[PDB]
Design a protein around this ligand. Structure first.
Ligand SMILES: C[C@H]1O[C@H](O[C@H]2[C@H](O)[C@@H](O)[C@@H](O[C@H]3[C@H](O)[C@@H](O)[C@H](O)O[C@@H]3CO)O[C@@H]2CO)[C@H](O)[C@@H](O)[C@@H]1N[C@H]1C=C(CO)[C@@H](O)[C@H](O)[C@H]1O
Ligand SMILES: [Ca+2]
Ligand SMILES: [Cl-]
Length: 448
């Protein structure tokens, strides 16, 4: 069962199409979030994608034909496409777009100055006490669309419906806290069918606008998850995670989209240094293992590029699939979705989807934890400086299983490529996990 999606940040359409066929489909990823495919301002910075000029599908990722090719190929491989949709604003200032269209003074190919709110600036203090300014003023000078206007709603809905017609299955509504939830309710009434929609709402608490206001229009990004997980893995105790989720004050599990990090917070935009990213190596593997094994929310794995400290920089000048070479793991594309522990965690989640409970939780009161998903699977993380050798109880059938974080079961089910884990006749496992390592086993990776 598909349970996890991935964000292939700044990947062009040809690269995404091949990745769906060679990796994502076979490994079981449910979908892919792509960078904004609509016309945007020229420039090499990654953020140019968030300044639209029109809704024509001509962007840094490729042209319309290439985009369509990608949706078809991915769809054939069993992988959905989620489009990052800009519903709050248009580009700032004046210039030219990726399809040749020029714009200026709040005048675009599809919008006139009267289709925007009167200009004003959102100040940092407005988030805590002025809901009106947060939703009607400009975010960093971006022209603010009059989202209450029937013309504007019809225009955005037509783009969304056009994308569904092509075959797109879902949408990420970017900068949603800056649009009144009621404006989104009206917009959705114009959208055909019921696609998967997740709204980017950054709410850490104490804001004039809350994430709970968006629960009725689709899923919502739970940013507290990313910050609390990072804070616990770096400065707290893993034993504290025994009741992670609604117990910590997060939104309902069935409404939340979660992640260890995202494209914004891994570079400072809306997230502090406690956020864990690819730069943290093994800490990142372990954080992902917990997230994928834990039954809270709909997770999305991050897929980045080494930005070399430059937070405005765009991606590598070389494709991922470069003439038979995979430009992964080095100083170009990081390809975290291909990392053994992460891919292994996705497999665990997919195979324990018939039991969403946390059973037999165990911890050493600090950084050693273990828990199961009933008879469907069991896992353990060791973040202490010495070997975890405790005997833990599971609800699994006795036998030998592959630690899917380090390998996989052969086609004939007679061998594993990584270490074997034994479940004794009484259901117990005598653990043997080194410092900063983990293990996960499930009922569909049992040796014959
Ligand atoms: C016009 C504006 O362009 C750039 O701003 C970027 C952000 O740096 C980038 O993070 C991204 O913003 C997203 C944000 O991270 C996310 O939380 C939110 O939900 O969605 C945002 C995208 O919609 O994209 C924007 C837009 O490209 C520059 O970094 C900014 O400096 C720049 N502001 C300029 C321009 C003007 C007016 O001409 C001044 O008012 C402004 O002070 C100046 O700095
Ligand atoms: Ca707005
Ligand atoms: Cl997000």
């Amino acid at each position: 069962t598909p349970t996890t999606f991935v964000h292939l940040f700044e990947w062009n359409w040809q690269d995404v199409a091949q990745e769906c066929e060679q990796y994502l489909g076979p490994k079981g990823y449910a979908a892919v979030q792509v960078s904004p495919p609509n016309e945007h301002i020229t420039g090499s910075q990654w953020w140019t994608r968030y300044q639209p000029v029109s809704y024509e599908l001509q962007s840094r990722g490729g042209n319309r034909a290439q985009f369509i090719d990608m949706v078809n190929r991915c769809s054939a491989a069993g992988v959905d496409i989620y489009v990052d949709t800009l519903i709050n604003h248009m580009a700032a200032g004046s210039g030219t777009g990726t399809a040749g269209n020029s714009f200026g003074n709040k005048s675009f190919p599809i919008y006139s100055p009267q289709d925007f709110h009167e200009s004003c600036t959102i100040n940092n203090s407005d988030y805590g006490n002025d809901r009106y300014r947060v939703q009607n003023c400009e975010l960093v000078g971006l022209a603010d669309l009059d989202t209450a206007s029937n013309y504007v709603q019809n225009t955005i809905a037509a783009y969304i419906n056009d994308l569904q017609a092509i075959g797109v299955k879902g949408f990420r509504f970017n900068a949603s806290k800056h649009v009144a939830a009621s404006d989104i309710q009206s917009l959705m009434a114009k959208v055909n069918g019921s696609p998967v929609v997740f709204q980017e709402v950054i709410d850490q608490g104490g804001e004039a606008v809350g994430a709970s206001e968006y629960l009725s229009t689709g899923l919502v990004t739970e940013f507290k998850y990313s910050t609390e997980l990072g804070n616990t893995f770096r400065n707290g105790s893993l034993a504290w995670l025994s009741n992670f989720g609604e117990g910590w004050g997060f939104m309902p599990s069935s409404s939340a989209v979660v992640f260890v990090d995202n494209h914004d917070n891994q570079r400072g935009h809306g997230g502090a240094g406690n956020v864990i990213t690819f730069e943290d190596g093994r800490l990142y593997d372990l954080a992902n293992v917990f997230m994928l094994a834990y039954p809270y929310g709909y997770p999305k794995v991050m897929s980045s590029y080494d930005f070399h400290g430059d937070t405005d920089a765009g991606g590598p000048n070389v494709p991922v699939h470069n003439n038979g070479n995979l430009e992964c793991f080095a100083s170009n594309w990081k390809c975290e979705h291909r990392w053994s522990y992460i891919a292994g965690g996705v497999d665990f989640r997919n195979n324990t989807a018939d039991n969403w409970a946390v059973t037999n939780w165990w911890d050493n009161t600090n950084n050693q934890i273990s828990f199961g998903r009933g008879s469907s699977g069991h896992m353990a993380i060791n973040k202490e400086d010495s070997t975890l050798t405790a005997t833990v109880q599971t609800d699994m059938a006795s036998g030998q299983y592959c630690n899917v974080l380090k390998g996989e079961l052969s086609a004939d089910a007679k061998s594993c490529s990584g270490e074997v884990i034994t479940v004794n006749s009484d259901g117990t496992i005598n653990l043997n996990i080194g410092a900063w390592d983990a293990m996960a086993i499930h009922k569909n990776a049992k040796l014959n």
